């Protein structure tokens, strides 16, 4: 289809990269795993703000925590309900962090999504956060020279 995956997007992890310089801080890279989870083609995702994954059962208090993290250029880890193109529900253990350039200025935001069947706690939450934080650090390396 349109927008053949870059090597970055073939990394075998669920992530997106946004560019805050573009209108509504939209997705510029989306991994193949993200595509498969959400059911959008890449051409349907690019240039859109990620909020299209939200729907009726998404907790708006949780969404505001993400908005505040982006505004304060800082990391956050939350869990929220998201929906596929066909309106299918999933829990999203989500981690955001900025990617900084060699002057320390925010160049991109990196988002890592761990989909699940339920809100997680205790060991499942800890193991999930371990995985998405390690992934985010990996994408910080992978995205630095884009």
> What residues between 6 and 65 interact with Ca ion by CB under 5 A?
none
Which option in ligand FMN, Cl ion, Ca ion, none does residue 54 bind, with CB closer than 5 to 8 A by kind? ligand FMN
Find the radius of gyration of the CA atoms of the chain.
14
DSSP state of 52: G
Q: How far is residue 39's CA from residue 100's CA, in Å, rounded to a whole number? A: 30
- Using CB distances below 5 to 8 A depending on partner kind, what does residue 107 bind out of Cl ion, Ca ion, ligand FMN, none? none
What is the maximal distance between C-alpha atoms in the chain? 42
Ligand-binding annotation for 25, yes or no, is no
CA angle 132, 29, 12 (to 5 degrees): 45
Number of residues in contact with Ca ion, rule: CB under 5 A? 2
Number of neighbours of residue 24 by Cβ within 10 angstroms? 11
Q: Which is nearer to Cl ion, 8 or 76 (CB)?
A: 76
Encoding tokens for residue 100? 């900084």
Phi, psi of 126 (to 5 degrees): -65, -45
Which of ligand FMN, Cl ion, Ca ion, none is residue 79 near (CB under 5 to 8 Å by kind)? Cl ion
Stretch that binds ligand FMN, among 5-13, 64-72, 125-133, 136-144 (CB under 6 A): 64-72
* Residue 16 touches ligand FMN, criterion: CB under 6 A: yes
Q: Fill in the per-residue mask, 71 to 90: x = in contact with Ca ion (CB under 5 A), - = not in contact.
A: -------------------x
Asked if residue 92 binds ligand FMN (CB under 6 A), the reply is yes
């Amino acid at each position: 289809g349109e927008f053949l995956a870059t090597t970055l997007e073939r990394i075998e992890k669920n992530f997106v990269i946004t560019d805050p310089r573009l209108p509504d801080n939209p997705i510029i890279f989306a991994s193949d795993s993200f595509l498969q989870l959400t059911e959008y083609s890449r051409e349907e995702i690019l240039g859109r703000n990620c909020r299209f994954l939200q729907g009726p059962e998404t907790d708006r208090a949780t969404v505001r925590k993400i908005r505040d993290a982006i505004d304060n250029q800082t990391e956050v880890t939350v869990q929220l309900i998201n929906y596929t193109k066909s309106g299918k529900k999933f829990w999203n253990l989500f981690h955001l962090q900025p990617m900084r350039d060699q002057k320390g200025d925010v160049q991109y935001f990196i988002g890592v999504q761990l989909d699940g069947t339920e809100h997680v706690r205790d060991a499942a939450e800890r193991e999930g956060v371990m995985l998405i934080k390690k992934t985010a650090e990996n994408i910080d390396e992978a995205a630095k020279e884009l």
